[PDB]
RNA sequence: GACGCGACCGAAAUGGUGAAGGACGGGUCCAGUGCGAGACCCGCACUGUUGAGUAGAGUGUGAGCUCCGUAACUGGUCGCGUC
């Protein structure tokens, strides 16, 4: 029954400017210490805010001190961290969490939200283009062969793939996206099939890109010779 | 000085079933003021141990904390498959609050051999200007594993980047793929692309490779 | 010996006074912990060891005590008066 649901992330440039909102139900804040903590993807969590009951004191992360302001409005049962002045190294999945009640469970913070990602970058909203990732016309390694779909050059994260709108998901491999010099991402999808049904079944990649309105699917088919 | 928590291993590996135990140091006191978080890949954090040793609240017995003056420990008796994970530890004596680096437990499982392929840029991507050379490794334990790009056998460098999926659910293996990129003007100017491949289960280096414009 | 008067002593009490610091306390200051839906703030409880400036970091005419007084008395002693 307790849930904490973050929302307004997304896309900003270095410098500007974006709020974050934690809608509490199951429970009214007013009674509890609430906290934000933030995860770079691919690192760990990283402690950011939190504020007090009764006394609404307020502390902070050094790396965010000054620029971020936590606050809650107990009259829409919601908490708020406003971020300034935002740079590159600030992106992350950010998350706000209840502390427990003391009796029960310390200072443990015994719910978290799903969290939201934020975008720091001055690169600009991009769908990306799909390109086929052929079966070799060899044939194998080892019975069976491989295709995929790479999904290269959209901004921001992330991006969904499937293959045949959800029905072919046995032996698929989606990668992680990887952040490309020129700044914009970049994955592939893949997938191992049998060599002997590769004439004869039909392999398509699903991909959406809601951010830039971009939705496509490819046909993944061998080729000439 | 902020206080620091200082969390060992940073991976290890364990079968089903086995005892295993992850550390953290305080760089001060933090009495008992530690809490334990797991966390899988794309959900958020869960509390499993408050004030270094409490079970909370719905959490197997199996997970256990303690204290040892400033050196905590969390040990899982027995793990099931649903317990590899990240583990993360905190303090919560003072402001500012710590969490420690986190412990990834992963499952240990027989030695496999990936399955290699090699993919050649497409005449669409081409067309931009650009081509993108990917090798994908298949479906092999443990996760290390070497690929070196060759162009017309000279060693690339710098020009290449990995990707590595989650342990699998079923079969415990991971898969890899590395994409080379070079320009279109550069992927011209050379004959065989080549992605060569060491892992444990590989007798000898495997070399995938095909030639530009031949099928 | 009784009663009476007086003086001296003692004396419950009391006006003023000024030293003592945590072994007099504090609804004094501080620190640590627990609790109240509460890490701090606020309240309560516990614990503190050179906790800790003796009259003020105090907007206590606080207790006890020092010194200077006053004193009920239904206490003592001595003198005197009358049997
Ligand atoms: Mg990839």
């Known amino acids: 029954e307790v849930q904490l649901v973050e929302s307004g992330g997304g896309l900003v440039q270095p410098g500007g400017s974006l709020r974050l909102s934690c809608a509490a139900s199951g429970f009214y804040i007013s009674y509890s210490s609430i906290h934000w903590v933030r995860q770079a993807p691919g690192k760990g969590l990283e402690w950011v805010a939190s504020?007090?009951?009764?006394?609404?004191?307020?502390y902070y992360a050094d790396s965010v001190k000054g620029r971020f302001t936590i606050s809650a409005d107990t009259s829409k049962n919601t908490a708020y961290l406003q971020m300034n002045s935002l740079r590159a190294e600030d992106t992350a999945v950010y998350y706000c969490?209840?502390?427990?009640?003391?009796?029960?469970?310390?200072?443990?913070?015994?719910?978290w939200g799903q969290g939201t990602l934020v975008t720091v970058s001055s690169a600009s909203t991009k769908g990306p283009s799909v390109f086929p990732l052929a079966p070799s016309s060899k044939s194998t390694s080892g019975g069976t062969a491989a295709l995929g779909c790479l999904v290269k050059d959209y901004f921001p994260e992330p991006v969904t793939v499937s293959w045949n709108s959800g029905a072919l998901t046995s032996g698929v491999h989606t990668f992680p996206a990887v952040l490309q010099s020129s700044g914009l991402y970049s994955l592939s999808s893949v997938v191992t099939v049998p060599s002997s049904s590769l004439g004869t079944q039909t392999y398509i990649c699903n991909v959406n890109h809601k951010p830039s309105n971009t939705k496509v699917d490819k046909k993944v088919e061998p080729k000439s010779c | 000085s902020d206080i620091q928590m200082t969390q060992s291993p940073s991976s290890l590996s364990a079968s089903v079933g086995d005892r295993v135990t992850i550390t953290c140091r305080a760089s001060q006191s933090v009495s008992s003021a530690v809490a334990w978080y797991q966390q899988k890949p794309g959900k958020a954090p869960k509390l499993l141990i408050y004030?270094?040793?409490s079970l909370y609240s719905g959490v197997p017995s199996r997970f256990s904390g303690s204290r040892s003056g400033t050196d905590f420990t969390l040990t899982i008796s027995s793990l099931q498959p649903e317990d590899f994970a990240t583990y993360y530890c905190?303090?919560?004596?003072?402001?500012?609050?710590?969490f420690g680096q986190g412990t990834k437990v992963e499952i240990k499982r027989t030695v496999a051999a990936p399955s290699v392929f090699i993919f050649p840029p497409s005449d669409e991507q081409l067309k931009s200007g650009t081509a993108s050379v990917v090798c994908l490794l298949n479906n092999f334990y443990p996760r290390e594993a070497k690929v070196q790009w060759k162009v017309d056998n000279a060693l690339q460098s710098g020009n290449s980047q990995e990707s590595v999926t989650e342990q699998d659910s079923k079969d415990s293996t991971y898969s890899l793929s590395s994409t080379l990129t070079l320009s279109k003007a550069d992927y011209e100017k050379h004959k065989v692309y080549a992605c060569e491949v060491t892992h444990q289960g590989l007798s000898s280096p495997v070399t995938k490779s095909f030639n530009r414009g031949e099928c």
């Open positions: 905190q303090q919560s004596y003072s402001f500012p609050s710590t």
């Open positions: 504020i007090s009951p009764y006394s609404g004191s307020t």
């Open positions: 004030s270094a040793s």
């Open positions: 969490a209840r502390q427990g009640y003391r009796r029960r469970s310390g200072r443990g913070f015994d719910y």
